[PDB]
Amino acid sequence: SERQQADMEMMKDRFAKLLLGEDMSGGGKGVSSALALSNAITNLAASIFGEQKLQPMPQDRQARWKKEIDWLLSVTDHIVEFVPSEIMVTRQRGDLLMNIPALRKLDAMLIDTLDNFRGHNEFWYVLPPVKVPPGGLSEPSRRMLYFQKDSVTQVQKAAMAINAQVLSEMEIPESYIDSLPKNGRASLGDSIYKSITEEWFDPEQFLAMLDMSTEHKVLDLKNRIEASVVIWKRKSLEKRELFEERAETILVLLKQKFPGLPQSSLDISKIQFNKDVGQAVLESYSRILESLAYTVMSRIEDVLYTDTLALKQT
Amino acid sequence: RSERQQADMEMMKDRFAKLLLGEDMSGGGKGVSSALALSNAITNLAASIFGEQKLQPMPQDRQARWKKEIDWLLSVTDHIVEFVPSIMVTRQRGDLLMNIPALRKLDAMLIDTLDNFEPSRRMLYFQKDSVTQVQKAAMAINAQVLSEMEIPESYIDSLPKNGRASLGDSIYKSITEEWFDPEQFLAMLDMSTEHKVLDLKNRIEASVVIWKRKSLEKRELFEERAETILVLLKQKFPGLPQSSLDISKIQFNKDVGQAVLESYSRILESLAYTVMSRIEDVLYTDT
């Protein structure tokens, strides 16, 4: 009963913070339910997985993750539209009907991968540098890590696609719009603008000419590009349509080249303003799974690389 | 117990999860505040459990649902908290600390009164007394919480030019009289229908807001007289529906604690009133 009351109280605790909009003073100076849920999902990931060293994830930790995510996603079971079939039947909303199970499957793939850290990990830490045995890893460990890396590579890519898709369906706040420069030229700057409006264009060649050396330089570029697209989409026609398309092409290259880039000013604006509870759960859950899969991928990459140095050293 | 513990955890998740949508099941957040959603859910739970209410015990199955679902609707208030000296401590907010326990008590007395169904007459008399205690105690809490809730701008924008315009010339002339007795005031008016009583309350509550937002001595007297009349109406007509200022405050309130307090106290007042009224029928049918 005590362990039982404690369980009920835990659920009550979680749903109260949500219903309060995070405002524990009571008087709803809080956030919307949609933002509360968005925040809760990202908070839970930070609590379960932390900053992520590659480490064992014991079964009890997998259990907290599973149930707490269950609680947070369960609202989506109640998000409904009516569809013809002659009758009108209630059906889960079309943007969640397959997306939610698709996300839960990526989640399970990720956990199943992290579960394989329960064995003998031959690497250790002293970002903390990772080391492997002087001879390098044993072959069974090397093969496990490659498989694990393949698995999280898959999750990262599928969750990034779901994330990008949901953000594309979320409304742009008037607050973002009023902040926009007057011009695509004004948001890009004169040098970048000239390049993107060139008669002949290769987005790979466009980016090689740029200083992309820091995470902050890339995010800056992304922010200017996204602004210019909003500016152009609201505004020659043939030619506006071309620059828009080239911009969207660069935005797609950035996601591939830089999967761990922070969220853009537009992303954050959409999230803060969004009142749609389904999209909030979609956006936050996909982002969380993409981000964890990316971090795990990179960390495994760190170990396999230093293993490559050791086999050359030995 | 394992499967029985699983079933309740699931049922409670469902109700909570549903409330996050603020009654907008399309999921677009088109939706009401969590405070109003919680207010309504308490209202609709009571109507489902009790409906219109003869004088019998509540079925065991309904008692258990009532208990369970009110436990869950109230639980949010456990987390409404403030910093106070005692060292500093974190404590349940002062308007909830004693009031929520007090209301749960009144709830239990109500259910007990119904459980207890010619010194038939003496029993029945006993029952009216303790349900009368409940009606008045719940009403005091309800009235107190409403006095602490913010008046919406929409209500203010709706207001007449002044207190005379709001009351009508005849009622304004009576309330501003040089001597005044509220009992005698009311005795001259046509109080023969619910709308007539309700329209009076609404007109009087509007004058109070008009006067308070604006001789100073005179307006303060008039305001005070208005208030004594509203106290008399509460006691003469315990079954009176909510005023438009009441309804406006509820629709607009974002405070979760006050929402739960107002709604729970309100359903307990009216439940109490109905059981009182239903006992009065048998006692009159007796006479």
Is A7 found in the same domain as A104? yes
> From B260, which residue of chain A is nearest by alpha-carbon distance?
A26
Which of the residues A4, A7, A12 would you substitute to probe the B interface, choosing the one with the greatest number of B C-beta atoms within 10 Å? Answer: A12
Which residues neighbour B211 within 8 Å (Cβ) at sequence distance 6 or greater? B163, B219, B222, B223, B226
Nearest-Cα residue of chain A relative to residue B259: A27
* Torsion angle defined by CA atoms of residues B14, B76, B140 and B218, in that order, rounded to the nearest 10 degrees: -110
Evaluate the CA torsion angle A18, A19, A21, A24 in order and state its sign.
negative
Nearest to A20 among B21, B31, B79 (CB): B79
**C-beta atoms of B9 and A13 within 8 A:** no
Bridge-based pairing of strands A88-92 and A130-131 is unpaired
| Amino acid present at A115 | D
User: Do residue A262 and residue A284 come from a single domain?
Assistant: no
Strand partners, B83: B90
d(CA B59, CA B199): 39
A275 touches A32 (CB < 8 A): yes
- Between CA B287 and CA B283 the distance in angstroms is 6
- Residue A191 sits in a domain whose CATH number is 1.20.58.1310
A34 neighbourhood in chain B, CB within 8 Å: 29
Resolution in A for the shown PDB structure? Answer: 2.2
A276 CA: distance to closest CA in chain B (Å): 4
Q: What is the DSSP string of chain A?
A: -HHHHHHHHHHHHHHHHHHTTT-TTSS--S--HHHHHHHHHHHHHHHHHTT-------HHHHHHHHHHHHHHHGGGGG-EEEEE---EEEEE-HHHHTHHHHHHHHHHHHHHHHGGGGS----EE--PPEE--TT---HHHHHHHHHHHHHHHHHHHHHHHHHHHHHHTSPPPHHHHHHS-S-HHHHH-HHHHHHHT-SS--HHHHHHTS---SHHHHHHHHHHHHHHHHHHHH--HHHHHHHHHHHHHHHHHHHHH-TTPPPPHHHHHHHHH---HHHHHHHHHHHHHHHHHHHHHHHHHHHHHHHHHHHHH-
Does A71 touch chain B if contact means CB atoms closer than 8 Å? yes
Query: In this structure, are A88 and A64 located in the same domain?
Result: yes
Q: Do A274 and A34 contact (CB within 8 A), yes or no?
A: yes
Residues A77, A45 share a domain: yes
Q: Alpha-carbon distance A100 to A28, whole Å? A: 29
Query: Tokens 């913010």 sit at which residue?
Result: B150
Count of the separate structural domains present in chain B: 2
- Selection from B149, B165, B169, B168 nearest residue B248 by Cα: B149
Residue type at A9 in one-letter notation = E
Domain identity same for A98 and A202: no
Find the CATH number of the domain harbouring A73: 1.20.58.2010
Domain check: are A29 and A5 in the same one? yes
| C-alpha radius of gyration, chain B, whole number | 22
Q: Which residue of B has its CA nearest to A19?
A: B34
Pairing relation of β-strands B81-85 and B88-92?
antiparallel
Q: Which residues of B touch A4 (CB under 8 A)?
A: 1, 5
Contact A267, A280 (CB under 8 A): no
Looking up tokens 């930070």, which residue turns up? A46
B132 and B187 assigned to the same domain? no
Q: Could you tell me how far CA A38 lies from the centroid of its own chain?
A: 12
Q: For residue A92, give the chain B residue with the closest CA.
A: B26
How far apart, in whole angstroms, are the C-alpha atoms of residue A78 and residue A91? 9
SS3 (DSSP) at B83: strand
Chain B, 208-267: which have a CB under 8 Å from a chain A CB? 254-258
Q: What is the DSSP letter of B238?
A: T
Residue of A nearest to B4 (CA): A4
- Alpha-carbon span B155 to A250, nearest angstrom: 52
- Write out the residue range of the structural domain in which residue A43 sits: 1-169+274-314
Do residues A167 and A290 lie in contact, with contact meaning Cβ atoms separated by under 8 Å?
A: no
Listed in sequence order, the residues at least 6 apart from A314 whose beta carbon sits closer than 8 Å to its beta carbon are A134, A135, A136
- Looking at the fold, whether B168 and B129 belong to one and the same domain comes out as no
Our measurement of the distance from residue B27's CA atom to the centroid of its chain's CA atoms, rounded to an integer in Å, reads 30
Tokens matching residue A230: 């909003």
Q: Which of A7, A13, A275 is facing B28, going by the closest CB pair?
A: A275
Return the structure tokens found at A184: 């695509």
Residues B65 and B19 occupy one common structural domain? yes
Is the CA virtual torsion A270, A272, A273, A279 positive or negative?
Answer: positive
Is A26's CB within 8 Å of B80's CB?
yes
Q: How far apart are the first and last CA of chain B?
A: 52
User: DSSP string of B165-229?
Assistant: HHH-HHHHHHHT-SS--HHHHHHHS---SHHHHHHHHHHHHHHHHHHHH--HHHHHHHHHHHHHH
Interchain CB distance below 8 Å, A26 and B256? yes
Q: Which two tokens stand for residue B145?
A: 């919480």
Q: Are residues B187 and B164 in the same domain?
A: yes
Q: How far is CA B33 from CA A29, B19, B60, B204, in A?
A: 11, 9, 33, 29
Contact B251, B22 (CB under 8 A): no
Count of Cβ atoms closer than 10 Å to residue A46 Cβ: 11
Name the pairing type of β-strands A88-92 and A80-84.
Answer: antiparallel
Q: Which amino acid is at B160?
A: P
Pair B133, B197 in one domain: no
Distance, CA of B100 to CA of B73 (rounded, Å): 12
> Is the distance from CB of A280 to CB of A274 less than 8 angstroms?
yes
All residues at 6 or more sequence positions from A242 whose CB lies less than 8 Å from its CB, including other chains? none
The two three-digit tokens of residue A1, written as one number: 């009963």
Return the closest-CA partner of residue B71 out of B115, B104, B111, B108: B104
Q: CA–CA separation, B152 vs B248, rounded Å?
A: 7
Cα dist. A241→A69, A265, B134 in Å?
41, 23, 71
Determine, for residues B34 and A20 on separate chains, whether the beta-carbon distance falls below 8 Å: yes
Q: How was this structure determined?
A: X-ray
Cα A286 from Cα A102, distance rounded (Å): 10
Same domain assignment for residues B118 and B228: no
